[PDB]
Amino acid sequence: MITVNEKEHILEQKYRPSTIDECILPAFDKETFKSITSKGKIPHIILHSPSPGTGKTTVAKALCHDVNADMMFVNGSDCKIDFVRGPLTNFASAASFDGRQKVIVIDEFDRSGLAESQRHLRSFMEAYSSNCSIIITANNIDGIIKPLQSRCRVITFGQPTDEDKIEMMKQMIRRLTEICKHEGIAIADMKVVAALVKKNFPDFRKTIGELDSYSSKGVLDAGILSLVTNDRGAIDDVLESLKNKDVKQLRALAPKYAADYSWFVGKLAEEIYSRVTPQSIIRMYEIVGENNQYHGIAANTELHLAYLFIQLACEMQWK
């Protein structure tokens, strides 16, 4: 069932889906794409994530493949005004001689300095709408000028329903399993495959890219599961010593993370937010924020970190 490109080793690009069905998508989304390929003609479309690797630029090529379009594929950042005047006007005006929908795929078109090109395109789209249609791919919509969103069906990715997420995940697990059969990767514990999917959910590219790096040993066993669910750096020793309100331990961990402070302080905010009660949140930002703020006035940085710990130990009421 699975398309393999075989000119690539890089493996998240080896398994890039050929057709709209091979693609793992939300139900309504897949159905709307089937609907489109059915009518045989392709409208102007925008696909956007903003979460990378949800399949935007893959489904772009697939849509073309299904309707058998004559398709020019173009790097967004390469598509400046002189390109549209030049190469694209040529293609859009020329007649495909098998009677194929002509389609211009502009990938990752959300760059800011192309707004001039995008406006120039708004007039173009109406002039050449009879021949050929445009499929834009973007990570961030606001980088697509409003009159281009007016002219398009804007389809929005990787923001599935609670049910879609549950189905999509099953579908992705089935797929990974199938990729493993093909690749010679032994699955000892299915739990690790369900874990890789869940871990990186919206992003299907990283979820496959992961599989490559945990396959060093050709097998996925309970031992790999520890590294997949496990946290390689973490904060745990501090978070725990904080809850326990002990000090000698906090006093000792200070020098450890004083090393790079701006990063540590960041994690601590991110990680404590989840682990503490609602008005402890508001207190924790005032405490961490103030501490971060004077860092770099404070002369002994290791001490300044100890001071932060003592402060949070006392005032944090833990859920």
Partner 1 sequence: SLFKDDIQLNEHQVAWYSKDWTAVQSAADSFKEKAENEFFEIIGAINNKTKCSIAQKDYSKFMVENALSQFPECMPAVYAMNLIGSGLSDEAHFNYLMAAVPRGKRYGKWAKLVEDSTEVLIIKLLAKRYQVNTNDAINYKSILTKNGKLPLVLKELKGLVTDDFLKEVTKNVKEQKQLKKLALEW
Partner 2 sequence: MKLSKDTTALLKNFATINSGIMLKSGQFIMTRAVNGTTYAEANISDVIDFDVAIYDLNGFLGILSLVNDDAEISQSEDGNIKIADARSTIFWPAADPSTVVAPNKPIPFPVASAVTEIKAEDLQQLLRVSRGLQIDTIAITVKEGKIVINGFNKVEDSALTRVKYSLTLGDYDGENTFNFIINMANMKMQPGNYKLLLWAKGKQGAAKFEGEHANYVVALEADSTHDF
Partner DNA sequence: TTTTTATGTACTCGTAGTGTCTGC
Partner DNA sequence: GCAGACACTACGAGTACATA
CA distance 128 to 250: 68
Residue 137 labeled ligand binder: no
CA distance 142 to 297: 39
The binder of partner 1 chosen from 3, 147, 187, 200 (CB under 8 A): 147
The binder of partner 2 chosen from 35, 112, 130, 279 (CB under 8 A): 130
Instruction: Count residues near partner 1 (CB under 8 A).
Output: 32
CA distance 259 to 263: 9
Q: How many CB atoms lie within 10 A of CB 113?
A: 9
**Interface with partner 2, residue 87, by CB under 8 A:** yes
**Interface with partner 1, residue 292, by CB under 8 A:** yes
Minimum Å distance from CB 80 to DNA?
Answer: 3
Quick one: CA torsion of 105, 111, 116, 119, rounded to 10 degrees? Answer: 50
The DSSP symbol for 108 reads S
Instruction: Give Cα 93 distance to the centre of its chain.
Output: 36
| 80, interface contact from Mg ion, DNA, partner 1, none, CB < 5-8 Å by kind | DNA
**Interface with Mg ion, residue 57, by CB under 5 A:** yes
The answer to whether the beta carbons of residues 79 and 106 sit under 8 Å apart is: yes
CA distance 74 to 90: 14
From the list 30, 75, 28, 37, the residue with the least C-alpha distance to 55 is 30
Minimum Å distance from CB 179 to partner 2?
Answer: 25
Query: What Å distances lie between residue 42 and 57, 100, 125, CA to CA?
Result: 16, 11, 13
Residue 285 labeled ligand binder: no
In this structure, what token pair is assigned to residue 237? 């020793």
Contact letters (x/-) for DNA, 183-222, by CB under 7 A? ----------------------------------------
Q: Which residues pair with 123 in a beta bridge?
A: none
Give residues 29-88 in contact with DNA (rule: CB under 7 A).
Answer: 77, 80-82
The kind and range of the H/E element at 150 are helix 146-150
Give residues 86-145 in contact with DNA (rule: CB under 7 A).
Answer: 111-117
Which of 145/169 has CB closer to partner 1?
A: 145
Using the rule CB under 8 A, give the single segment among 54-62, 89-97, 108-116, 287-295 that binds partner 2: 89-97
Minimum Å distance from CB 153 to DNA?
Answer: 24
**Interface with partner 2, residue 7, by CB under 8 A:** yes
CA distance 294 to 191: 46
Binding residues for ATP: 12-15, 24, 53-58, 205
Site for DNA, rule CB under 7 A: 77, 80-82, 111-117
Site for partner 1, rule CB under 8 A: 50-51, 85, 89, 116, 119-120, 122-124, 126-128, 142, 145-147, 266, 269-270, 273, 278-279, 281-282, 285-286, 288-290, 292-293
